[PDB]
Motif scaffolding. Structure first.
Motif, mmCIF file in Angstrom:
data_model
loop_
_atom_site.group_PDB
_atom_site.id
_atom_site.type_symbol
_atom_site.label_atom_id
_atom_site.label_comp_id
_atom_site.label_asym_id
_atom_site.label_seq_id
_atom_site.Cartn_x
_atom_site.Cartn_y
_atom_site.Cartn_z
ATOM 1 N N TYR A 1 17.122 3.255 -5.120
ATOM 2 C CA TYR A 1 17.004 1.755 -5.299
ATOM 3 C C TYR A 1 16.275 1.592 -6.925
ATOM 4 O O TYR A 1 15.370 2.589 -7.252
ATOM 5 C CB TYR A 1 15.988 1.388 -4.227
ATOM 6 N N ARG B 1 14.402 2.695 -0.558
ATOM 7 C CA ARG B 1 13.748 1.257 -0.262
ATOM 8 C C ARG B 1 12.399 1.663 0.225
ATOM 9 O O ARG B 1 11.483 0.998 0.143
ATOM 10 C CB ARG B 1 14.498 0.256 0.320
ATOM 11 N N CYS C 1 29.943 -4.853 -6.420
ATOM 12 C CA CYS C 1 28.867 -3.744 -6.320
ATOM 13 C C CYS C 1 29.502 -2.397 -5.706
ATOM 14 O O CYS C 1 28.845 -1.499 -5.991
ATOM 15 C CB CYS C 1 27.587 -4.142 -5.727
ATOM 16 N N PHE C 2 30.537 -2.551 -5.161
ATOM 17 C CA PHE C 2 31.123 -1.453 -4.131
ATOM 18 C C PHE C 2 32.585 -1.320 -3.965
ATOM 19 O O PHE C 2 33.154 -2.152 -3.342
ATOM 20 C CB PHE C 2 30.034 -1.324 -2.891
ATOM 21 N N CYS D 1 25.022 3.748 -1.087
ATOM 22 C CA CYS D 1 24.416 2.803 -0.329
ATOM 23 C C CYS D 1 23.121 2.422 -0.777
ATOM 24 O O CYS D 1 22.075 3.300 -0.896
ATOM 25 C CB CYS D 1 24.353 3.069 1.193
ATOM 26 N N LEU D 2 22.882 1.311 -1.528
ATOM 27 C CA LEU D 2 21.910 0.735 -2.206
ATOM 28 C C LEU D 2 20.626 0.599 -1.283
ATOM 29 O O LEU D 2 20.784 0.134 -0.206
ATOM 30 C CB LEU D 2 21.999 -0.730 -2.863
ATOM 31 N N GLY D 3 19.395 1.224 -1.538
ATOM 32 C CA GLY D 3 18.317 1.137 -0.664
ATOM 33 C C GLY D 3 18.108 2.473 0.179
ATOM 34 O O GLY D 3 17.230 2.755 0.819
ATOM 35 N N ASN E 1 16.658 4.114 5.523
ATOM 36 C CA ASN E 1 16.663 3.418 4.265
ATOM 37 C C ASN E 1 15.637 4.210 3.136
ATOM 38 O O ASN E 1 14.645 3.335 2.779
ATOM 39 C CB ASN E 1 16.373 1.949 4.374
ATOM 40 N N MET F 1 21.970 1.547 -10.428
ATOM 41 C CA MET F 1 21.500 0.375 -10.255
ATOM 42 C C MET F 1 20.484 0.039 -11.354
ATOM 43 O O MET F 1 19.617 0.924 -11.579
ATOM 44 C CB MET F 1 20.678 0.134 -8.899
ATOM 45 N N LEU G 1 18.678 -6.228 -10.674
ATOM 46 C CA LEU G 1 19.263 -5.711 -9.440
ATOM 47 C C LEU G 1 20.683 -5.287 -9.266
ATOM 48 O O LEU G 1 21.409 -4.984 -8.263
ATOM 49 C CB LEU G 1 18.970 -6.533 -8.166
ATOM 50 N N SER G 2 21.435 -5.428 -10.405
ATOM 51 C CA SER G 2 22.698 -5.303 -10.483
ATOM 52 C C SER G 2 23.048 -3.713 -10.503
ATOM 53 O O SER G 2 22.533 -2.864 -10.544
ATOM 54 C CB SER G 2 23.565 -5.765 -11.838
ATOM 55 N N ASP H 1 13.851 -1.555 -8.937
ATOM 56 C CA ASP H 1 13.503 -2.733 -8.977
ATOM 57 C C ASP H 1 12.411 -2.876 -10.140
ATOM 58 O O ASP H 1 11.162 -2.179 -9.954
ATOM 59 C CB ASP H 1 13.047 -3.253 -7.748
#
Ligand code: NA
Ligand code: NA
Ligand code: NA
Lengths: 296, 296
Positions: free
Chosen positions: B195, B219, B115-116, B189-191, B216, B82, B87-88, B197
Motif C-alpha cells: 500500500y 494497510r 487498476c487490475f 491486491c492493494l492493501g 490486510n 501503487m 492512490l493510482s 499513501d
C-alpha cells in the motif's frame, strides 16, 4: 441473542418507479432468506451466502444473471465471502458461464487451501467440483445489451451477525459496464469488496471498484470503528474519503459485533434491506425508508 | 527532503551460504537501481519499479525468472504497483509467458482506466501493448523443479520516498510452491501485497499470501502508524497479529512519509536492503546487518 442481516443491491442512478417494485421484491426476498437462516440458528456465512445467491439469480441486479456486460458484450463475474471467526475466505475473479459465483467462492474457502482463484483456474476448479456450466447468453439481459451500447457510443452483498456472535460478509458482481476483458474490481478483494472480523464487524461494499480498491473501503470503515466511531460515522468518513481523495462514488452496509448496522451511499441510490428484532427495514433513496413489522 | 528506497527479496528458510552471496548481489543491484533513480530526481514509482524489475530478472528470487512453480510445473505471476500521491495503481494476476509482470502492472496503471487485470485479459492487453511473449521454460529453473517435487512428495518488493515527498510501492511474485492453477495471492491486491499513501507511508509485503490477504497486512501496518506507532512497532504488531490470528508467517518493508523505515519478518530469513543518506544497509538473517558507505 439478536441476529441481523443486511443486504444491498448495488448503487444506481435514480430508478424508474415501476422498476423499484421489482427491486424491492428482490431485496425482501434476499433478506427473508438471510434472516430465515439466522432464525433457525444457522451461521452468518450461510446467511450472507443465501441472500447473495438470491440476488445473483435475480436479473434486476448486477451479479449472476443480470450482470453488466464487458467490452465484448460478455459476462465476467467476481465474488468473495469471508467468515469473521478465523478470517477464512474464498473468492473468484473473472468467472464465466456459471449461475452462482458466490457458491464457487464458498467452495474455494471450504475445499482448497487458498482464498482466491481466477479465470481459467477457477473454471477448472468449478468443473472438478461438478459445478454445472450454463451458457453465457443465459446471464445476458436486454436491459444490459442496451446499457452497453449506450456506454460505448459516447453488485450485490450482505452482512450478518449470527446467534453465536459470529459475523460474515458476501459480495458478488458482474463488474462495470464495458470493462476490459479480464478486468477485476474490488468485489473479490478482501478489505475492499468487504471484510469480516468478529472483533469488529462486517462490511460489504458497492460502487466504483477501482476507487474502492485504492481506498480499501471495507477495511477502512472497520478501522474507524476500531477508533471508536459509530457505524454511521465510520461509513460517512470512509465514503467521504473515497469521494474527495479519488473521486469515487459507492456505498456499503455494515454491521458491528454489537449489532449496530447501517446502509450508506454516495451515489443517488442503493437498494438495501435489513432484518432484526422481527422488523424488516428497506430503502432505495435517502427519502423512502420503510419499516415493516415481521412475525416475531 | 532526502530520498529512501528499501527492497526485499522474499522470505525463506535458511539459505545455503554460497547462495547467500548471489542473493546479496541481487539485493545490492536492486537497491543501486532504485537509489540511482531517486538520486537523479526520479519518482518513487519509477524507483520501486526499477528495483523490482532487477529482482524479477534475477533467478535467485521468486518473481519473474526464478518464480516458484504451480501444481502443473508452470509459472504463473502476480504483481502490483501503487503511487501514494493520488492512490493510482496497476496490478496483474496469473500472468504467464512474460519476463516482467511489474512492467505490465505499470501499463495497467498508465494506459487503462482500471487498476487490475487477470489471466487472459492481462495477456491480451500485454499483446496489444507490444509486450513480448517469452516461452515459459525460460522462467523455470532447476532449483524450482526440485522444490516442486519435494513439496508434492509430502516474492520481491520495494518502497520509496522521493525528492518531492511522494511515496510508492511495488511487489511481484511467482506465488507459493505447488499452488493450484489460477491461484492468486496477496501480491496483486492493494492493501495486502502493499500500500502507498503520501499521508502515511508505503509498504511491500512477503510471505503466506492467504494470511496476508486475510489480515490486510500492508494497510494494517500503516494503520498502526496513523495511530502514532513507530515503523518498527507497527511492523511487529501487524506481523504478530498475522502469526497469532491466522498462523501466517511473512515479512515486510515500510517507509513512512517522514523517512523512517524498517525491514521485519517472522520467517527464518528475508533478504533486504535500504539506501539513504549515502549509506547502503543490507541483511538476510535478523542477527546481522551490514552498512556500506556509498560515495553519495
Ligand atoms: Na442478478
Ligand atoms: Na527472479
Ligand atoms: Na507479497
Amino acid at each position: 441473542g439478536n441476529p441481523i442481516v443486511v443486504v444491498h443491491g448495488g448503487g444506481a442512478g435514480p430508478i424508474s418507479k415501476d422498476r423499484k417494485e421489482r427491486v424491492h421484491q428482490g431485496m425482501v426476498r434476499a433478506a427473508t432468506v438471510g434472516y430465515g437462516i439466522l432464525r433457525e440458528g444457522g451461521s452468518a456465512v450461510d446467511a450472507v451466502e443465501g441472500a447473495v445467491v438470491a440476488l445473483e439469480d435475480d436479473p434486476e441486479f448486477n451479479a449472476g444473471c443480470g450482470s453488466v456486460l464487458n467490452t465484448n458484450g460478455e459476462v465476467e463475474m467476481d465474488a468473495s465471502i469471508m467468515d469473521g471467526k478465523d478470517l477464512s475466505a474464498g473468492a473468484v475473479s473473472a468467472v464465466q458461464c456459471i449461475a452462482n459465483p458466490i457458491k464457487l467462492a464458498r467452495l474455494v474457502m471450504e475445499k482448497t487451501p487458498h482464498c482466491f482463484l481466477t479465470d481459467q483456474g477457477a473454471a477448472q476448479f468449478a468443473a472438478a467440483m461438478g459445478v454445472p456450466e450454463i451458457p453465457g447468453e443465459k446471464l445476458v439481459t436486454e436491459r444490459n445489451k442496451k446499457r452497453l451500447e449506450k456506454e460505448k457510443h459516447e453488485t450485490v452483498g450482505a452482512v450478518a451477525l449470527d446467534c453465536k456472535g459470529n459475523v460474515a460478509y458476501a459480495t458478488s458482481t458482474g463488474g462495470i459496464v464495458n470493462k476490459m476483458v479480464g478486468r477485476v474490481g474490488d468485489s473479490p478483494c478482501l478489505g475492499a469488496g468487504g471484510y469480516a472480523d468478529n472483533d469488529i464487524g462486517a462490511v460489504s461494499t458497492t460502487g466504483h471498484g477501482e476507487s474502492i480498491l485504492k481506498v480499501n473501503l471495507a477495511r477502512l470503515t472497520l478501522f474507524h470503528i476500531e477508533q471508536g466511531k459509530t457505524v454511521e460515522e465510520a461509513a460517512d468518513l470512509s465514503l467521504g474519503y473515497m469521494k474527495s481523495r479519488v473521486k469515487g462514488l459507492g456505498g456499503l452496509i455494515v454491521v458491528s459485533k454489537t449489532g449496530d448496522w447501517v446502509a450508506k451511499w454516495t451515489s443517488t441510490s442503493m437498494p438495501w434491506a435489513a432484518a432484526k428484532d422481527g422488523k424488516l427495514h428497506f430503502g432505495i433513496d435517502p427519502d423512502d425508508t420503510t419499516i415493516t413489522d415481521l412475525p416475531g
